Amino acid sequence: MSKISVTVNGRRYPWPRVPAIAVCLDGCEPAYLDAAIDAGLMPALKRIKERGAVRLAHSVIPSFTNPNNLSIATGSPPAVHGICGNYLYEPSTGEEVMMNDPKFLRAPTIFQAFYDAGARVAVVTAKDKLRALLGKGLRFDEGRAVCFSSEKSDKATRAEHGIDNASAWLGRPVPEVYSAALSEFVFAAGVKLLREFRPDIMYLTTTDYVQHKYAPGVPEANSFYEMFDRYLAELDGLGAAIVVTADHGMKPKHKADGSPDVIYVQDLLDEWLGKDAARVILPITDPYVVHHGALGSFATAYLPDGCDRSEIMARLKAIQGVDVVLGREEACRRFELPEDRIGDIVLVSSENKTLGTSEHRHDLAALDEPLRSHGGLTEQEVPFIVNRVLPELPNAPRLRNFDAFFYAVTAAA
Ligand SMILES: [Zn+2]
Ligand SMILES: [Zn+2]
């Protein structure tokens, strides 16, 4: 007998004999898990690590939420699936268009591929803007798919999500968006789906609310992972093959006085090339956000026609805190990004700095806590832990977070 598989974006996924789950712990710098385990708070993960496979993996650059979640969902980098940031910029018109509609996704998800092959598939997200992207191609007319967010759980319908009111079903209220509870709801839904829906493939993805606010080992960070471990214990006990990974890590990005350490790339370009001659794009969030949540460690810039790219790149690279400056072609090759959705140049900042646009009009500091963020090479390293024995599993840099489902189904097969 030949083995059964589903081929997605040029990769062969064996059919899972038991449920295959990947958990994306948004912003889970490996240190978070080490600290919580050391504090005695994660007995399930501690045992799972001892008996299974423990690795570090590499995220996609930019180490942001959307590109990495869609990489995990498709098993491919953004050069394939097209989601390389939260929005794209069109030099003509000067328009910034949001990249939340599934129409922007250019490759099928593993979820759709398994669904079309007759599998039962579940996808649960914390925030809703990722739900439609991750659910692209799923259908809800055969009782074989469920896709909803914690955020909009009370709005789920049979026809569009595979479930009527996931909040009522789970018996928990819709959580506050800016809370740990938004992610707890995902874990709880995942457990109930594993028990009652019995998916062949399931993805659970959280938000990095806690991780932006709290460093590894502090009480509020530890409590989040203590909470997660309870659900991990239950998922594991139910017999599923599980990969625990992250979309990206998290690092402090503040000066000694606790204020954000920012390089204002638009200001610099306005001086060298002329005001607004170039356009700096910050992929981390939506462009209308102006409250410190727009500060990440990766940026791209669209330059005026004719200007010396090579010279501008050297001027930027010379600045202490700007670690990497690459042209479109090199950046897309190295970071596996689509040329048509990236600027003329790509910038990556140092470990404890972020990239901003301008000081004129400025980006206001909202929350009190010292800035923590991601986007750079220094948040590329993430945990990759499997609750099965897998001696052949690679390690970073060869192992990618978007190998999660490949190895989850392999473990399950
Ligand atoms: Zn994230
Ligand atoms: Zn974040």
CATH code for the domain in which residue 301 is found? 3.30.1360.110
Q: Which of 331, 348, 350 is nearest to 340 (CA)?
A: 331
Longest Cα–Cα distance of the chain, Å, equals 68
234 and 294 together in one domain: no
> What's the chain's Rg over C-alpha atoms?
21
Q: Do 25 and 133 sit in the same domain of this protein?
A: yes
- Please name the helix (run of DSSP H) or strand (run of DSSP E) that holds residue 149, with its range, or none: strand 145-149
Note residues around ion ligand 2 (Cβ under 5 angstroms): 208
Q: Which residues surround ligand 1, an ion (CB under 5 A)?
A: 26, 65, 208, 247
Query: Same structural domain for residues 240 and 358?
Result: no
Per the structure, the complete domain to which residue 306 belongs is given by: 259-369
User: What are 373's strand-pairing partners?
Assistant: 251
Spatial distance between the Cα atoms of 139 and 134, rounded to a whole number of angstroms: 12
Residues 142, 11 share a domain:
yes
Q: Which residue from 393, 395, 387, 281 is spatially nearest to 342, judged by alpha carbons?
A: 281
Q: How many domains does the chain have?
A: 2
In terms of domains, do 361 and 385 share one?
no
Considering the domain architecture, whether residues 144 and 228 belong to the same structural domain is answered as yes
CA distance linking residue 307 with residue 286, whole number of Å: 28
What is the CATH classification number for the domain harbouring 121? 3.40.720.10
Cα–Cα distance measured from residue 193 to residue 44, given in angstroms and rounded to the nearest whole number: 20
Whole-number Å distance between alpha carbons of 290 and 356: 10
Question: What is the helix (H) or strand (E) element at residue 310, kind and residue range?
Answer: helix 309-317
For residue 46, the CA-to-ligand 1 centroid distance in Å is 24
Let me know the angle formed at the C-alpha of 405 by 402 and 410, rounded to the nearest 5 degrees: 130
- Ligand 1 center to 314 CA (angstroms): 30
Distance between Cα 2 and ligand 1 center (Å): 39
Q: Are residues 35 and 104 in the same domain?
A: yes
Deposited resolution, Å: 1.6
Annotated binding site for Zn(2+): 26, 65, 208, 212, 247-248, 374
Instruction: Report CA(246)–ligand 1 centroid distance (Å).
Output: 8
Sequence-distant (6+) residues with CB within 8 A of 175 are 150, 151, 181, 182, 184, 185
Whether residue 326 contacts residue 309, with contact meaning beta carbons closer than 8 Å, is answered with: no
**Residue 310 Cα, ligand 1 centroid: separation in angstroms?**
32
Q: Are residues 48 and 172 in the same domain?
A: yes
Beta strands 381-386 and 241-245 are antiparallel
Cα within 13 Å of Cα(228), Cβ side: 28
Structure tokens at 153: 């759980």
Closest ligand to the CA of 25: 1
